[PDB]
Design a protein around this ligand. Structure first.
Ligand SMILES: [Cl-]
Ligand SMILES: [Mg+2]
Ligand SMILES: [Mg+2]
Length: 133
RNA sequence: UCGACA
DNA sequence: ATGTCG
């Protein structure tokens, strides 16, 4: 019910779906952009949302930060919890990059630890997540 | 058959 | 429209 302002908010941005995908993480309190992924030619909204959360985990772990991560993606939050991105996007030469990043994200998750709470951003009550495009 | 999150 | 889960 209470927004945890001392947190990291991440979100995907795209042009088409499947389409060009990117993501960024921002300080929930100030909106300051902390990281941003170079656009990936072809990917899905959910893969991007997943990549954004995993990058956030890696970003916070490297800085010894225990702050939670906000995401508005029910799908991505579940994929991270399961440490498995159940995407339906076809695996071919054109989607090789997005799949490589997804596979590497999964790989990282299955070989590292973290206590970072991954929280659902309550869009219907709080408005658009701060990392929204 | 939807409902929900994007 | 398309991507996903309950
Ligand atoms: Cl990535
Ligand atoms: Mg989103
Ligand atoms: Mg958004």
């Amino acid at each position: 019910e209470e927004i945890i302002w001392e947190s990291l908010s991440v979100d995907v941005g795209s042009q088409g779906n499947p389409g060009i995908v990117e993501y960024k993480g921002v300080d929930t309190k100030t909106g300051e952009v902390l990281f941003e992924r170079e656009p990936i030619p072809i990917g899905t909204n959910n893969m991007g949302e997943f990549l954004a959360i995993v990058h956030g985990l890696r970003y916070l772990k490297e800085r010894n930060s225990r702050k939670p991560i906000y995401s508005d993606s029910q799908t991505a939050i579940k994929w991270v919890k399961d440490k498995k991105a159940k995407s339906t996007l076809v695996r071919n030469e054109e989607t090789a990059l997005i799949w490589k990043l997804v596979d590497e994200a999964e790989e990282w998750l299955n070989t590292h630890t973290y206590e970072t709470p991954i929280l659902k951003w309550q869009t219907d009550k709080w408005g658009a997540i701060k990392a929204d495009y």
